[PDB]
Design a protein around this ligand. Sequence first.
Ligand SMILES: [Co+2]
Ligand SMILES: [Co+2]
Ligand SMILES: [Co+2]
Ligand SMILES: [Co+2]
Ligand SMILES: [Co+2]
Ligand SMILES: [Co+2]
Ligand SMILES: [Co+2]
Ligand SMILES: [Co+2]
Ligand SMILES: [Mg+2]
Ligand SMILES: [Mg+2]
Lengths: 708, 708
Amino acid sequence: EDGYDMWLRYQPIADQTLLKTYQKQIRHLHVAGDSPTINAAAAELQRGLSGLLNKPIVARDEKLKDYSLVIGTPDNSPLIASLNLGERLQALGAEGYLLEQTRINKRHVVIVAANSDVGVLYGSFHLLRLIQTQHALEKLSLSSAPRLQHRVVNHWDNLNRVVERGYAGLSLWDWGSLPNYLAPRYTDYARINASLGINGTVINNVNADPRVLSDQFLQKIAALADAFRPYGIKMYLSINFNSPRAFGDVDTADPLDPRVQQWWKTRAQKIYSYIPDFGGFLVKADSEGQPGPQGYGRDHAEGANMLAAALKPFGGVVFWRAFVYHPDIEDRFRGAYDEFMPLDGKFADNVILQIKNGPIDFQPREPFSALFAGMSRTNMMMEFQITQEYFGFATHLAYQGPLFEESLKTETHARGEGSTIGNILEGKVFKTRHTGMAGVINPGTDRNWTGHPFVQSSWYAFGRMAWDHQISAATAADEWLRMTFSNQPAFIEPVKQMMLVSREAGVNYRSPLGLTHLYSQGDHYGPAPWTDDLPRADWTAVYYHRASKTGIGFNRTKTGSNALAQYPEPIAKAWGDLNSVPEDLILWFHHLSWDHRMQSGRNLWQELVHKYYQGVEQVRAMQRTWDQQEAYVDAARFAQVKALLQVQEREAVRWRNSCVLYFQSVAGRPIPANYEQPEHDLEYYKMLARTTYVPEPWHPASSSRVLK
Amino acid sequence: EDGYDMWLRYQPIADQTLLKTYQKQIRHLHVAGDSPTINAAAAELQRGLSGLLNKPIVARDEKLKDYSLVIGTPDNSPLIASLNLGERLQALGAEGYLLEQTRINKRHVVIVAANSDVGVLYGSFHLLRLIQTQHALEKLSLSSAPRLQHRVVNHWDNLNRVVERGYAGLSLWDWGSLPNYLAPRYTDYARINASLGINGTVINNVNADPRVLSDQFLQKIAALADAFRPYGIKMYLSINFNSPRAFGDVDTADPLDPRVQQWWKTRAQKIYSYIPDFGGFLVKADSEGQPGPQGYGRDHAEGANMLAAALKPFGGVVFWRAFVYHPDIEDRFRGAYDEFMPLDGKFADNVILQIKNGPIDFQPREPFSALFAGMSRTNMMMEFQITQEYFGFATHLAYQGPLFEESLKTETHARGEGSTIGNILEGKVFKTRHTGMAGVINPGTDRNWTGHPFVQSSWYAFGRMAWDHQISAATAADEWLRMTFSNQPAFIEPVKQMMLVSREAGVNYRSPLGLTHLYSQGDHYGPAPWTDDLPRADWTAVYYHRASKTGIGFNRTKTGSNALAQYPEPIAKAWGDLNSVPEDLILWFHHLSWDHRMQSGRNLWQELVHKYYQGVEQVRAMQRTWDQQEAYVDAARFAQVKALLQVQEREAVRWRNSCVLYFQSVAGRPIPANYEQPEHDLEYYKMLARTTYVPEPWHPASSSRVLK
Ligand SMILES: [Co+2]
Ligand SMILES: [Co+2]
Ligand SMILES: [Co+2]
Ligand SMILES: [Co+2]
Ligand SMILES: [Co+2]
Ligand SMILES: [Co+2]
Ligand SMILES: [Co+2]
Ligand SMILES: [Co+2]
Ligand SMILES: [Mg+2]
Ligand SMILES: [Mg+2]
């Protein structure tokens, strides 16, 4: 087990009684269709069933035999059409499917039925998942359809093949051998994402390189698109707003200039000539120095709509990122809301605003982005981060399912009760045209795709939740563990709980209680809560915590920045009252004296210390849990995870000691005697922050030769 | 077949008659010893024999059975001792071995015998190689001992894990998880190199990072050294001469300053506390801005000897690179010789000068480095390049065996006939005490280690030739092809010949006839023979070719720079006379009119055009040859090599057109009508040089956004 297969491990079912049952139920594989997508489904079922059932199962188009798996749509499988499934099937739409044990012409069968070929593919992966997770097929009758339209992954890959916030190797795309070399890995990438129902990929960095729109690169990108197409995955590209200038074709990129409009129209025509079902563009504009419409005195709708107009005749969409914050504002938290609310309704119907889960930047816990509850006339989609920019690169274990679930199940009160983030995304709150979620996965050429084996679980949960936003982190973890490691109950339960606590542990010894942005800048590996004096205050740590001898926290109530007024009234009320604000968010909204007593009875200083130390204890407990699983996991992955957990524990201690000693230096209060005193002093950990290796190829910090 | 095993593919012997024979001969594996090295040999033989013979062969220490393979030294195996090998073993020295079919108390055996455990390891790999290449064991009786002491690989790896001139992925060394995670791949790396008898590795870039000498990194490096030790591979590190300053411990790095001498002595003590058998240091000093003794007004012996004195008590050596050339000299060709000749005899006995095969920089063909024939009182070692900095990265097929063989068998006439480079390296010509060869391999995390599958053949040849410098490129290719792909004679012959011509093809489409240094600077992927106006003239192309309307070439005879006088008289005489100078070197030493007639009857202009076109034809012929091998190669590697060869042909045409059109523009002569004429002009290929993707993560050109 080297992780290359991820969760698509088709090894013989270990429970011999269950294996025999599956062997009796699925003796043949019947596939009448022959489109590329049906062929991909058939190939997946052949390899998967053959492996899981430990016998040769070959897809055939032959007279139906007793005890067959029969797959297809009414349009390509006369057997399926003969069942007259009618409305029940039709209601599942263009990507849904029905899995059902039934009879056809007196033969015992299990069907994978859908309206479209991609629905057959998705259903086929679910059928395999049922076997992989040891679910019974007897009396099976289950249907499913995705709850979001655009279920996409994002890769922050540079064309040099270095990945920005990439902890899993070089970019998968081997530009030097494209288009000529159609690497098997491109197909395996497509299988991985299609197994989750992911139907789009943005393959290139949002800090966008204009070369992707050149013929040289489009020929390469078209080869990738061709590999992805049978698996239902559309190609998207991040674009550079200044491309007309970069190509030397126009002396401006102003979206109101007719020459610019024409440049993008012509470029779209070129793209669609290479990739006829091209998805569209992802855009990071006017953010962190990236070009945009504001560079020409125009607004984000004028810019987005210009691009959207170019893509509309071809059916493309524009994912326009709302991650924008100008140096000039008083509270970064308020930025996106204040920038985009005036434009609600001004975007074209093929523009979708892509908004991060929170208003800052993927911090271990953030309150929900206010835009989701405010924009009632604009298409929106969520952006989540899987790659562990803020959760420890490839060395810490941090299953992200609980972060995604927490977000999706958050009640916003946008139009009263029931206005959860997931319901908003689905279109059940505000009537909308385009729905979706994007996940920043940043895998690479490492054998196991993700570096840390458990980052696979985060990618898994993302895709499952993009399909059904009400799926819990626990449900996704149970599935992933069974598919990836073992179906043994004694293994599943403790490792599932280990996964479920890992997100909170990462919060606890980095920045609990609503603290945030305490990372070393800009590499983000280790602690630096003392960070100050950067060219912009909102890039520092002190800006956010505002720690002093008297207290800590950032006042965003009516008496401070009043960011709470950007939320619906029930949220503003709940979060603005000390009696109701959740402690896990409190310092986002309140500057509190250190003597404030928390629910536990500890004062705020004591609680801060308690949480930091709790995070380390949680890591140690994870180590003990993992050691107890040796009998159930292959030796190689066992050893790898064990080692990584040791690194994590060392780094968690460094985080805890650095932050506690730093906040102590400001508050001037003792660490209670029942907590182990840090091994060294504050200056020592400032030295460690300057000298501890940063394990990422992209960020310049990994090249830093500082030794003191 | 994904190339992870390289040439250690232990698949069942395909010839059923030969397989039966091996099965009869080796029925058991007898191993009395139990040191880490013997254990590693036993493990290799268990896996190797079991795979090749298709039956379970387990190493055991038990009463001898008939038809056993018996391994050991007289010290650890009484059976081996009983054979009383005597003088037979004495000739093998510390690393050699004897392989022999014989008898022990009437039992039929094949022995792997040596004086040392590492000798048994090397012998064990040779035994496996005999089976892998389908050689008979009946009547086997052979011995071998390495001809060079230090048989080392070099890795230009930065600590951020980006490899300089690295076309095969990120650095193997996962610093973020070391020392905790002892990845299996570290052991596989050791197996690969030990299989060739390679006994040392320099793991870090010659553009040296001082962090490697810090405790943080020494702990990590020690883990790697621990993984390598049972395979006989010692650890070496490239050092930064300014380290005492970088650590903030001394305000100078002058090697004559007692504080500096002490700094290095104390640092060596620290290294050896972690790695008790540490090999020593590799040094790039006073070259390309890297620090060195000359920065303190001292000479290279003063610097090298200071380091050597620090290492001497512990048995360490200093590999001091002679790759040095200053911007203000008349002819870069003369640089290293004029720098180091005055220092002959001034270096300590534990210093070895590491000299590239030629005096410029690993160009497709260079004359031998004059230092090899001139330094008679200094230890020397050769530096070869395997990574394809100048042979097309990971997209061109370029077996380097013929380059290495051509070098090693070059007659220098240093001290009579037989003064070949190989004999000089062996120490027999000048009678020196430390000998070796280093190969710059720059592998990475790509699944097949080398990116292009055929780069594996160059690594293979390097190691074979480091063991025996008279091994031919053809012999090593025959072995490698059998081990890596197939023993079918109809496959081996044409593919061996394709390999053998590939180096010359790469000379021909780039820079034939003694031309050199025509690459795009500094990325080195594509053509740029027009290159001029760089901050140093010796980094340009025009500096080397001196092409004009009247002629081309660089006068290094007595009437020019007189670099020929740096060579022994017979070489100066042969190369200085137009009647005897080899055409494949001619423009290195003569500036010739375009009307000079070559041996073919063509004038020099016509000959230049002929060679450039010939290189492209040779690539097209390699494509046809490879296509003919589809029945003998697995589909995946077949497809990959086929595609890469397409990329190579496209790039070869670009090289040909660019260079022929460039030289035409200067000479003002027509391309003979029989050749296909380019259709675009020279400006078009200058535009392609600025815009064609450079496929390497490290060099900044891969990030260039130039589009015109
Ligand atoms: Co894994
Ligand atoms: Co980069
Ligand atoms: Co736990
Ligand atoms: Co207190
Ligand atoms: Co390969
Ligand atoms: Co670098
Ligand atoms: Co050929
Ligand atoms: Co002519
Ligand atoms: Mg960022
Ligand atoms: Mg160089």
